[PDB]
């Protein structure tokens, strides 16, 4: 096909729309894959809430930063990989080499930004269309036979919540408690990825009765409402030694609040959850001596192969709702009214 | 609505800046020549709010005017000397009355013809009574086109909005031969038909923009190769299926200075751009530098005799698919509210 | 043949043209190297070298000459169809010879010239105002056998311009047709000669000089009025009031352009083939009859280049010349800037 | 490159083409030297190969293969406009690109190509069926991309051929219009699938095998006729008493040309593209109707070709092909002489 259908945002202010665009060829070094599922998540939103001053992605944009494919043509001198492959996709594009490249840690390039390398569907081309090229083969993850709709959400909702975790991972020992905020989206693979790899136990905290519900269900020990008796609640189910770690995937200020009045002594929070202007207040009698706060970024390389051996494995259980490429901007006016249940994955 | 008697129930623009209104006003008679039919169907035309739209010093069409220029029927009365019908027989109604006489008329070109302004000659529902009505008289046989068994409500819209981007396509389709590129921008109710129609009548590459994803959509059912959003990226995400060679015709249903603008944008050299709708002001800039060479320009008028004749025979052979939303006589004025707010899914029909 | 040549260079922005002294071309495989014998003057030169620096992208030094006749020289390596001492028109607007349109016989509208970097001699390629000048392939080649080189010269440009505009839209111009000419300078002139050879169309001629009028008369005008406000009116009075079937608007003015949006008939045409800057037609709903198609052409293709050669040679083709030599070539410039050369300007080296 | 390369060749009058080994040929100035990739054959070179020692002339030995498809190998001194590695189709009626249908993009009607001894490949020239070819000129090249080249090479005469006596009167064929195909098992099947891609017309097939009009119907064909003494009046019958638009006879025959005019309409059309020898229609007054235009057509024009393989590209052309090994060349005459071969016959070197 000499074309290709994508969802694109291509206008400051409007909704996506289903386009027709050039279907891309690799050059040297690229991939091109036929994408099997694309998944949507709030970002998406975030990005296309931006006023005209502070976006600086270009337009158009094919929209999808959670990204699964099977090989479909190998540009120039690419090996590695073979024609019907299934893979997923590194988001976190770096330039491959600087220290912290070097190290594996390429969702925290220190070149990335000057050299204009942008993650697909956040400035450079996304997944949500019917081929998408990648830059490098080092940006491919194979899944094997994994359903790549169950795919798809691995490579952010199940990658960003393992990134924050292995943070700290050495403190969630036996012993330790792990709160999370949220358990939406992300919180809800949080906890099945801290109930994987750690003996930690795991406080819930929601707004909503139905997502603590399924909280319970996926490991969670104990369930707290949010609000202003959520601290009160999670102290009180944890005597008065607080949470050794907090992971925060709401963002807001009041859940930051609330997990600066839990945290432990010498633990963590993790502002993984995005609200503009929302802030820890990291200061002496603000926060506990030795309790570390961070904003973390995505994932690394090897983190996404360790995410994905844990789907492989039967350890992750993302819930999706399935639609088709034409039902991508209704998927995303879904997830504006928080309508979708877990993950939304578009397939082509 | 079962015909009762000796006056119809008629959608008429009565005074400058109102809305049309039904009336009961008496059923014509036809004289020597002319043809009376029972309207089976009676379209809605953009045009129709542009006429009404119009001040007092600019509508030179009279009142009251029986509004619609998109009519369909059947023969109900043969006036005097009037062979070739006979009562019953569907026929569609050919708009753009001309003379009949000058060199353009004598090569069915009436939509061109040089005399009907001087005569007086109008089209119905544009100076003419119209076809919004149970009954409606048309002046000559030679503007009766017979439409057999096909259905009034998908046979009406052929009138123009069919006819309409027939004749823009006709007037440069040897330049649409396979390699070639035609851009339509507009899907609405000429654009969705024009598209079928490049489809049926060339091997061009059909490539559509419009401004709702619903629309885009629309493109694609109908048969478009490719859709693209309208605006200021319109004319880089042509040139991206292109291969930035330029399209060999633009065919511009919106015909808003912007629209013509992505036009002149993605014509390629030696091509044709077709504005065919209707924004008071907006123009084309044909100069040099402004525009590729050889890259011609027009404003069409309706269509052809001839053409008429051939877009019925397209829908005949099953090759169009006239999008459609039927209403009553008495929601005339109502239909032509959800058409001023572009609520209409394809073309509006009044069916009596 | 000697080592060295003379010719007419354009050498540096805002500058004017000079006489200078360069190596003679040889022709590589597949060119053809021509003695010229006479290579014609026009106002678009004095337009190119108008740019301003930026502007200009048509390179530095560029012989001047974009209407080229001569006889061939030398044949490069592998190019049959002509023999040494044929007579030759040069063909002006060169193209890729491969893409749809090179193949449909329109190399003026080629698709690939501009990427490939393909221009006029003359217009980025070194022209024919000098002793010897190349042609990049035969094709380029017209024969004009013992037609006089001084005026076959002229036929290249301003014949070859409006026969093609003519040629546009000649099945609009049979009998009963009229045909608007405004300007009868250099191209109406012969426009108008084109139009009575290959039509029964009505011509009116329209121009701001009672010895223009007169002059288009002389040609074969049936009419002829003065241009300005008053045109339109005067055209339409002549015609009972019904338009004209064709205006090609040889003077390309804002005020003609108008004028011929004002006359042109409905289902008509308007060919605006005068240049000036900023100049253009606005087609529009109200602001142009119903069908009146409009546009710029742009030279002619080289069947249409042989079409104007057999007119020249039945003798239904004159084109008023004045000749220079090569060193006066710069002095011919001047006059043409200055609108003094009756006619069109020809250098014979 | 070796040498040497084997060919397909006639040798000798009422003999059976034979591979044998000749030179490799080297590009001269202009020229193209191909690796042939697909090498069609059609039932052309069995007439070619059917004419009587009493008529030859001149020509033997000839490498066989007018539908010749390659990647450029090597460029002649002076061609640009390909590299290697191109993929390109050869546009078959070579003319002398500098008479005026020449100039006009209509080499297959050129009228010095005849006087000029230019031939075309396969039939006076080496053809394709042989490792590799040389092409006269750049300009009878016409890339393909990445089509596969055997479902190319049928189209440079399958396609062209029944592309072109469509073209000729496509603006007869619009909606409303009926066309009558004429036999429907090589260049009838395409010019089926090809009235069905570039117009509205309705599509009557005739043929003498049911198979091959079932065929028909599945490519586009709106009915199906038996050819015969009763076909003229079945046709008839579906078009009321009409009549047929035009008549696209791929067969030929008398017979054939005889229903053509018993059903062309009034200012209709006959093409008469098949081949039999002395067969011919009677075009004089009350022997067909008034205004139906009779031609026998040739080949077609490479602006035609480059369509043809654009409607190919977009998956509007599909003709079923039988490959052969470049060694198998005879074994492929010898299935196409017993009409065993379904669709068209392609060799591989
Ligand atoms: C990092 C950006 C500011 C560009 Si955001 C939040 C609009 O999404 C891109 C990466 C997707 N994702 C989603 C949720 C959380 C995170 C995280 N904590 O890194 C990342
Ligand atoms: C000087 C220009 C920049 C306007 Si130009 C590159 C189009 O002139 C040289 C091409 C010859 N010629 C001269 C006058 C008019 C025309 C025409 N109307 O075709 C063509
Ligand atoms: C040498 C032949 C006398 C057999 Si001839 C010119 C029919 O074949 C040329 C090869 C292409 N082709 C095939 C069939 C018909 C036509 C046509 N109608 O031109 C052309
Ligand atoms: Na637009
Ligand atoms: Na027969
Ligand atoms: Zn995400
Ligand atoms: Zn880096
Ligand atoms: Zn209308
Ligand atoms: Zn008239
Ligand atoms: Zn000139
Ligand atoms: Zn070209
Ligand atoms: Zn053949
Ligand atoms: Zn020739």
Redesign the interface.
């Known amino acids: 096909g000499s ?1 290709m259908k994508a969802v ?1 945002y ?2 400051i202010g409007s ?1 996506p ?6 279907t891309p060829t690799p050059g040297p070094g690229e991939i091109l894959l036929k994408v099997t599922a694309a998944g949507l998540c709030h970002s998406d939103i975030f990005v296309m809430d931006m006023p005209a001053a502070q976006y600086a992605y270009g ?2 944009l094919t929209l999808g930063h959670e990204g699964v494919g099977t090989v479909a043509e190998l540009g120039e001198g690419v090996t590695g990989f073979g024609v019907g492959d299934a893979v997923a996709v590194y988001g976190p594009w770096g330039c491959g080499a600087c220290h912290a490249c070097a190290r594996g840690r390429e969702n925290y390039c220190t070149r990335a930004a000057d050299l204009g390398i942008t993650p697909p569907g956040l400035g450079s081309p996304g997944s949500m269309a019917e081929y998408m090229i990648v830059d490098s083969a080092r940006h491919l993850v194979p899944i094997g036979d994994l359903d790549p709709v169950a795919a798809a959400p691995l490579t952010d909702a199940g990658l960003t919540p393992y990134h924050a975790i292995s943070r700290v991972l050495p403190l969630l020992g036996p012993g330790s408690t792990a709160v999370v905020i949220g358990v939406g989206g992300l919180g809800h693979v949080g906890i099945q990825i801290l109930r994987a790899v750690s003996a930690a136990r795991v406080i819930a905290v929601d707004l909503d009765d139905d997502r603590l519900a399924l909280a319970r269900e996926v490991g969670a020990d104990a369930a707290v409402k949010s609000g202003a008796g959520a601290a009160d609640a999670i102290r009180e189910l944890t005597g008065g030694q607080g949470a050794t770690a907090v992971f925060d995937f709401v963002g807001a200020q009041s859940t930051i609040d609330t997990a600066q009045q839990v945290v432990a002594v010498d633990g963590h929070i993790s502002v993984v959850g995005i609200h503009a202007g929302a802030h820890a207040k990291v200061g002496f009698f603000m926060i506990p001596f030795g309790a570390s706060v961070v904003t973390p970024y995505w994932g690394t390389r090897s983190e996404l192969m360790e995410v994905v051996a844990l789907a492989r494995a039967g350890r992750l259980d993302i819930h999706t709702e399935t639609f088709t490429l ?1 039902e991508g ?1 209704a998927a995303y006016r879904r997830l504006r009214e928080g309508s979708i249940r877990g993950r939304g994955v578009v397939v082509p």
Do not use: N, S, Y
């Open positions: 074309h694109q291509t206008e909704e729309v289903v386009v027709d665009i050039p337009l158009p034409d901007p």
